Subunit: 887 residues, 2 copies
């Protein structure tokens, strides 16, 4: 129950009321006479929007200082008025001066200085004298209404006077609220002569005495203004609200009755007939539109802490949406509104009385509601409880009044309630779930390898591409992936058994992506060498490269033509080994990466498998050692923090190949032609004695099998390391392997990730997002985005991989970037490589997320970090920032 | 010396030559008949730009597959031609089909399929039959010229035939190169009848047989075309280049002579007179423009590895810029061009012959040049040596030919050579500099506190603000900083002795910035309490808050009015302690934060000083413990990694206040009204026994003094922790305190930061950037941006602080955001808080960097991480990405 004095240790100052009633006026200068704390940290905070000069959104302050406090601040206000009038001529029609606590203490007379400066300026000055300490926000509202009636109403006559004029009193146009009801008011004939304190011109506001009916939306702020206008002008008021459908229907019907009283009689029911016609048509359409949302929003519990008239109206609206109220409490409302809400408040719903944070926490922990529709104060206090929240206040950024506003309200309610993140957040944490679920998750991770391998390519509802001319191919050569994995080995250069031209566009692409040199030497093959036998060139190139650069190991990969005429690299390898025994000490790893076999991902997987099957040998079972085979999707930073996470549990990680140290970008003391930085051959040889194997890519599964049978280690697989659900499984596997509990830093990062998820899920709801990436880095991004609310319009894959059908999206198919812009229609986010920028230019989608390879137009792509809890937080924040910027 | 066969173990395939001569044609379809590696990783890579349909930038591939290789690929090409003609009707006038190595091996006849499909389409088909293996890029260039002459030249007549027509042969319009010479050619009367293979329409290209003079820029690619056109049409050629001023002058003079020969006689010197007039005027203007750059670019050494005609021309241009050549080697050039360059090559300059990476490294280590102007291959090979580099190739993104192009060339040369990052990068690293410099740097850090404190505010050339009406104030209440520092203490809520309205807009601002709840309770003071004595309310509020929330410590901060009437909080504190001895166990910290005293920074510093002077007590000198007083500018992530860096050296860090754990955003198991997460009172009490004190803010210096005399610990200060120069000093201080060498991870991160600096300095050169931030976070950003090349147009400070004059910028002053948009004119980057977004909307500056407080429109601001080597890398990458996006 409202109890309008106060006890020390909630209601703001009277300046807050003055600004909440006067700031929404657009083309005026709101000069605040006082120190910083009054206007320094409060300007541009009001949720009022406008389609006008937008002069109100900028804040004006006199900047009360040291000397002028003990001398006087009237002269500073004089200069401020004069300068603001002179400089902002043509953009300001009036200006409001607000008295503050310090101004009142100093004895500054706002009225006197305003009268003194009035004669010297052509812009009217309104002396709002509302010191902050004189009361709560209600005193400020009343004083603002007083000054509005005294100095604004009754000064100019309207140029056009519609035969049915009404005044909107108490509506402040928060996030387009006014623009939802305005299309209804002029459609049926009424003219909004003056909408008070919202999207309102000052001259437009001075027309309010020539109307015939007043509509009071917020009773709390401007009821005294309505009463005084009734007393002085014979203007009947009407207390209604526009939040809902039945409430708006009743409001419009009452408006029609009171309009038909004042102009003509109730007989010749001119207004009522059109009001009923519009009501019937628009209500039928709105119900048809709202039906799909109610089914998903039926039976959910609700608790509301809303101050003003919304408390009465929203309870109706929620009740017609298909939800019931468990608790309802208001701090900022009239006693009549409280009693009316209590009348609406059904039994078994208890009215809150403690409006403080402690009382709110009590009622939230007691009622245990699903959704809480409350104010800005209880905004983050309810998110910490991990329950859906909807904000209906100045900070709200959506229109909720009117029929279209009600549709938007239901959309936002479904956005915040049915988000797929709430069950994940409410799930039991790794540090407290009992041991049987830990073993089940560990066994699931262990068997993920065979689950991925067993899935057949034939039974796949995603379609085999059947395009002849593909334009803008997002695929890359598998030789690119072979070179990528070869660069991850310390002191080694890659020998491309190709045609000397494939060396270009492979070295060049990697150089433009990672911004680092690539060696990538090639054995030149001309037309003469293509005919007869092509394995002379392999021996010649091996001899030349060993005699020139002296590598300790050589990686040989095949190109398209070398598979077209089908020379076996291994026979040339054994021949070269036999002819020159002096080169026995330098091993060679050969991997078949034909160009019809797929894209960078398969090439990477195949060369990793070739490395695994050849170099390491089975020995002892030294515990505390784990072997990680990173996928092609992980950037060097991801591999570096995979190493960091492995070291956190005390385990010794061996990463094969080590992209994190070679292609990350490092200025060593001396530049060498070979690729240095990766894992040495001793480490890759001793990696076969590890106690466990982890692979962070689906395509790596086969490689894991290649080490399961050769040495005997158990394998563990994770298709992604993002989304707080896969990172948890990674933590479980790491804890099981190491045998020690998760460190505290990971618990802290999980808490931070939860806080990021709760504070950012509003921008990830029902956003149409398209993704066009490789076989991997597409599952990760799709599962992360679809796991946060966004529905994937199209998940376009570079090549066919196992488990593509399980992705949550409308359609999955394999296609180029042409499929991307022919399928990204009506989408706001594109997740594709940099080369897809053209598609954005064709569709006007300004939100492009650079993922995968290649990314050349954005620097730091190789350092892009999206692994673990911290990487998940970084990706979430980047995507949320893109959503905020593009809209 | 060029040596046009090749040895296995550089020249690309013939398809690269075909594309380098044919791809720059804009409105054609470049269908590549082959597997992925030919066009999958090469499309949209050519540097040719256009002002036309831009159909060339998208790549077309037939996608040779498994079965069709062993069956046949002609039918796939047939379908591809048909589909591309049907779908892209209206955007394509012609289309080129390229034969690849796999296509040639399979025996596919491009000519036969093109002839078969010609009758069924209205778009001409050009069968470019250049298999990759048949030779190097030169064979591809010759074959492309052959097919251009055979199938393009001599098919249609020009609609308009200027009396002086010329053909531009061998110019490909790399980054607006053509658009620098085009304004000169039509100004003096000549008509460019056909510019070959650059910004050229196909129909426009078929007009080339009706000209009278040929200009050959690149002799290597299209000299055979010029010779054949001379043989078949009587068209004299002219081998010149347009890189330079004297070279362009000679080219234009020769053009005038050869034009006056063919149309009329040399007598009536119509062309020569206007050519000489334009040459004189434009050369005088260009020399006047170029003079300022030569002074900064005089005497610098240079080494060039450029392939084509640029080798001859740029040597001239560089020589006229004021630099000399130490070594010059070309791989892709004619023997005549090589001999001509050698003739230009002065003595003591030795021509390189080994064009491989090893030879380039040899010559770079031997000559030791300052600047290297070389190709895309040697791009990152020369950046690792830490020497300035300028790219003149397809990857170059600037026009360098013509007079305006030469001005741009000098601008880019000065950008890459005189960057202030090269001396920093070449400076000796922390792990190798000897001990006297280590001691000097440590002593400088120790004395930084007194250096900052000793600087007087009176001797400061930055100006005392003298504005009456300040609009859009970027300042915040010092009570905001007091609350910020109070939130960093575990299990404590802040009591605001104010007027119950300042509680709003302080709690609300922090809540909108950090997206976390703020307790911030206030002792309500009305008009009656303002008169008489206001210290009854302090006792009442303290009693209420202690009896309700039961805190273990209470932070009391004063507001503006409480200083206007001047009640002493401490007398009320002692009175409250006396009246209720039961509350003895709960200490209270009081800090005077009046609202005329400054902004958030000073409030934070003052409350930190109040906490330091009261809670801790001097005890033992337990080694290995360090005390860190973070500044108000550091976000929670910065404090968290300050802790991480301190723990890396084995030191135990005590952070006061601990923002990194309270306001970072964490979903704890239970929501409490008090602010939890910070440092406990036991830790803050035992922090007085540390072996060293570190402060990361200038304003914190006084606080450090407050702990220097109370306990006796030496102090160390760092005004910033970004830029690789201050992080180094931080590492030196940490190593000196701990007594152990820097770990390897920091060395790796320093190498990565160096690589980021070398690869991103091109976007930070001569970029006009404006900064409007607090006293701190402005020195850091200004020193980082000015330390990377950008010149600061205006460094606008929220309030006057010590050492403001030393910032590198044109003008420093204290002002609001109005000063920001009145001073950010002609700037491309704005570094200000989120509330300055309006200024961007007024100036069209789309690159806005959200720094400082408040930042509400971008999520994750509190997690924004700009500390240490990794934070410096993150900030560098974010700023570079903004520069790339906004331009
Ligand atoms: S296959 Fe032939 S044409 Fe294609 S990239 Fe390799 S060398 Fe060049
Ligand atoms: S000084 Fe007075 S008017 Fe200003 S914010 Fe505080 S209570 Fe409100």
């Amino acid at each position: 129950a409202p109890k309008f004095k106060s006890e020390p240790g909630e209601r703001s100052c009277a300046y807050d009321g003055a600004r909440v009633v006067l700031m929404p006026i657009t083309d005026v200068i709101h000069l605040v006479h006082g120190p910083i704390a009054c206007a320094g940290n409060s300007w541009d905070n009001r949720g009022a929007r406008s389609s006008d000069s937008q002069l109100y959104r900028r804040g004006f302050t006199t900047e009360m200082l040291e000397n002028d406090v003990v001398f006087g601040g009237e002269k500073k206000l004089y200069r401020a008025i004069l300068e603001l009038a002179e400089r902002y001529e043509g953009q300001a029609k009036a200006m409001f001066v607000y008295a503050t606590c310090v101004t009142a203490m100093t004895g500054d007379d706002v009225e006197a200085v305003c009268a003194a400066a009035g004669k010297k300026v052509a812009i009217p000055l309104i002396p709002v004298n509302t010191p902050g300490f004189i009361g709560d926000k209600n005193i400020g509202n009343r004083l603002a209404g007083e000054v509005l009636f005294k100095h604004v109403i009754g000064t100019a006559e309207p140029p056009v006077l519609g035969e049915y004029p009404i005044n909107l009193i108490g509506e402040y146009n928060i996030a387009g609220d006014l623009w939802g009801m305005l299309p209804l008011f002029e459609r049926l004939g009424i003219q909004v002569l003056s909408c008070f304190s919202g999207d309102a011109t000052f001259e437009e506001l001075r027309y309010a005495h020539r109307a015939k009916l007043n509509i009071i939306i917020c009773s709390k702020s401007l009821t005294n203004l309505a009463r005084k206008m009734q007393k002085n002008y014979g203007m009947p008021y009407l207390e209604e609200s526009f939040y809902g459908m039945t409430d708006t229907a009743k409001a419009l019907r009452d408006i029609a009755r009171e309009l038909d009283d004042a102009v003509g009689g109730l007989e010749k029911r001119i207004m009522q007939d059109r009001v009923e016609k519009l009501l019937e048509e628009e209500e039928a359409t709105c119900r048809e539109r709202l039906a799909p949302y109610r089914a998903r929003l039926e039976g959910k519990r609700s608790v509301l802490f809303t101050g003003g008239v919304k408390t009465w109206s929203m309870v109706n609206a929620l009740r017609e949406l298909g939800v019931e109220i468990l608790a309802a409490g208001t701090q900022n409302s009239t006693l009549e509104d409280f009693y009316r809400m209590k009348a609406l408040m059904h039994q078994d719903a208890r009215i809150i009385e403690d409006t403080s944070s402690a009382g709110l926490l009590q009622v939230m922990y007691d009622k245990m509601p699903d959704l809480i529709v409350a104010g800005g104060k209880t905004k983050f206090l309810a998110l910490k409880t991990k329950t859906p929240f909807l904000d209906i206040n100045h900070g709200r950024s959506h229109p909720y009044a009117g029929y279209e506003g009600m549709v938007t309200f239901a959309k936002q309610l479904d956005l915040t309630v049915n988000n797929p993140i709430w069950p994940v957040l409410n799930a039991k944490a790794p540090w407290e779930k009992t041991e049987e679920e830990l073993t089940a998750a560990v066994a699931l991770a262990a068997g993920h390898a065979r689950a991925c391998l067993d899935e057949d390519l034939k039974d796949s509802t995603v379609k085999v591409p059947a395009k002849n001319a593909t334009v803008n191919p997002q695929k890359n050569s598998p030789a690119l992936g072979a070179t990528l994995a070869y660069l991850g080995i310390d002191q080694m250069l890659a020998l491309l058994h190709g045609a000397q031209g494939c060396s270009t566009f492979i070295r060049l692409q990697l150089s433009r992506h990672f911004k680092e040199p690539v060696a990538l030497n090639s054995t030149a093959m001309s037309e003469d060498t293509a005919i007869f036998g092509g394995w002379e060139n392999l021996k010649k190139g091996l001899k030349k490269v060993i005699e020139k650069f002296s590598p300790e190991v050589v990686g040989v990969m095949t190109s398209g033509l070398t598979e077209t005429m089908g020379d076996d690299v291994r026979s040339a390898i054994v021949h070269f080994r036999q002819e020159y025994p002096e080169h026995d000490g330098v091993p060679v790893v050969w991997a078949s990466t034909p160009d019809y076999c797929g894209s960078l991902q398969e090439g990477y997987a195949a060369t990793v498998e070739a490395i695994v099957r050849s170099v390491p040998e089975p020995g002892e079972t030294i515990p505390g050692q784990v072997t990680v085979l990173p996928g092609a999707h992980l950037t060097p930073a991801d591999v570096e923090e995979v190493r960091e996470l492995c070291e956190a549990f005390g385990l010794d990680p061996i990463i094969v190949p080590d992209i994190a140290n070679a292609l990350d970008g490092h200025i060593d003391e001396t530049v060498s032609p070979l690729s240095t930085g990766g894992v040495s051959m001793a480490r890759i040889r001793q990696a076969g004695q590890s106690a466990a194997t982890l692979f962070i890519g689906d395509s790596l599964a086969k490689a894991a099998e290649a080490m399961t049978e050769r040495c005997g280690m158990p394998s563990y697989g994770f298709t992604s390391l993002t989304g707080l659900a896969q990172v948890d499984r990674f933590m479980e596997t790491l804890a099981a392997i190491a045998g020690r509990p998760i460190p505290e830093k990971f618990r802290r990062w999980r808490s931070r990730l939860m806080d990021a998820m709760v504070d950012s899920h509003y921008q990830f709801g029902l956003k149409k997002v398209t993704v066009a990436l490789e076989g991997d880095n597409l599952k990760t991004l799709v599962n992360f985005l679809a796991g946060m609310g966004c529905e994937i319009q199209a998940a376009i894959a570079a090549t066919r991989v196992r488990g593509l059908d399980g992705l949550p999206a409308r359609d999955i198919f394999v296609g180029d970037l042409e499929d991307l812009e022919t399928a990204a229609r009506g989408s706001d986010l594109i997740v594709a490589n940099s080369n897809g920028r053209q598609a954005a230019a064709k569709l006007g989608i300004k939100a492009h997320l650079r993922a995968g390879l290649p990314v050349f137009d954005r620097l730091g792509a190789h350092q892009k970090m999206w692994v673990g809890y911290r990487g998940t937080m970084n990706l979430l924040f980047e995507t949320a920032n893109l959503f905020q910027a593009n809209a």
